[PDB]
Amino acid sequence: MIEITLKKPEDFLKVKETLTRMGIANNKDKVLYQSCHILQKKGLYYIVHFKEMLRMDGRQVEMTEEDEVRRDSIAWLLEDWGLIEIVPGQRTFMKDLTNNFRVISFKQKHEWKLVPKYTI
Amino acid sequence: MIEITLKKPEDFLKVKETLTRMGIANNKDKVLYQSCHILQKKGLYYIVHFKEMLRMDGRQVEMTEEDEVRRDSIAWLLEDWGLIEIVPGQRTFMKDLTNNFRVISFKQKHEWKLVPKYTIGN
Numbered sequence A: 001m002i003e004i005t006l007k008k009p010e011d012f013l014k015v016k017e018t019l020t021r022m023g024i025a026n027n028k029d030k031v032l033y034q035s036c037h038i039l040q041k042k043g044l045y046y047i048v049h050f051k052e053m054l055r056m057d058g059r060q061v062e063m064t065e066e067d068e069v070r071r072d073s074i075a076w077l078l079e080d081w082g083l084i085e086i087v088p089g090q091r092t093f094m095k096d097l098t099n100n101f102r103v104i105s106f107k108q109k110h111e112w113k114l115v116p117k118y119t120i
Numbered sequence B: 001m002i003e004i005t006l007k008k009p010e011d012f013l014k015v016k017e018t019l020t021r022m023g024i025a026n027n028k029d030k031v032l033y034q035s036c037h038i039l040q041k042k043g044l045y046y047i048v049h050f051k052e053m054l055r056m057d058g059r060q061v062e063m064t065e066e067d068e069v070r071r072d073s074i075a076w077l078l079e080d081w082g083l084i085e086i087v088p089g090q091r092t093f094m095k096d097l098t099n100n101f102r103v104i105s106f107k108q109k110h111e112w113k114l115v116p117k118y119t120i121g122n
Helices: A011-019 A050-056 A065-080 B011-020 B050-055 B065-080
Strands: A002-005 A022-026 A031-034 A036-041 A044-049 A113-116 B002-005 B022-026 B031-034 B036-041 B044-049 B113-116
Touching (some): A002 A065, A011 A036, A011 A065, A036 A050, A044 A050, A044 A065, B002 B065, B011 B031, B036 B050, B044 B050, B044 B065
Antiparallel strands (some): A002 A044, A022 A031, A036 A044, B002 B044, B022 B031, B036 B044
């Protein structure tokens, strides 16, 4: 998971809503699958892929490399966007190649079907 | 070991020479210890730490986290200067040249004992 500092503690919910609009798109039947979530654990904040949360609930699930590239590039994009800082000193994919994602704008939002993948 | 792209083949010896001039400086007897090397292997290029090369020769050496961070931040620095591009799709540390790090110019190098940590005996 990636350790994260937010600027102000309200922001957790802003970040949570923004992650709703970042994932694998099915641009044909306009469905977008949420990839990563924000969790606070033991006081520190983290960007977590949906599979790590499935792993946290006991499921023997393993991220793929495509999966952790996706997570690292969503975390780096929200940093680019100035919404999270990635706590210094972690080893991450900082240049993508392998799977990328779709970001939907807050007003394309309701035109799209937002489906959380955390095998609901 | 970090895979890198070079702008043109003759940039290899350019980087090989740059890496001799950046590392841990003992200024009281002016020795600069180089620790990262550029590698060509099957037509691809790599920034590699001397412990990965000692490792690659059969020695029982452990790269610490501190070694990987120095190697990656020297790859980031060469990238900032435009001598290389790190290849996308690799996990790296952020650039952080904290503890002792020094770059010495080309003109000034004749006063430094440039010393590869790779060849250091014992």
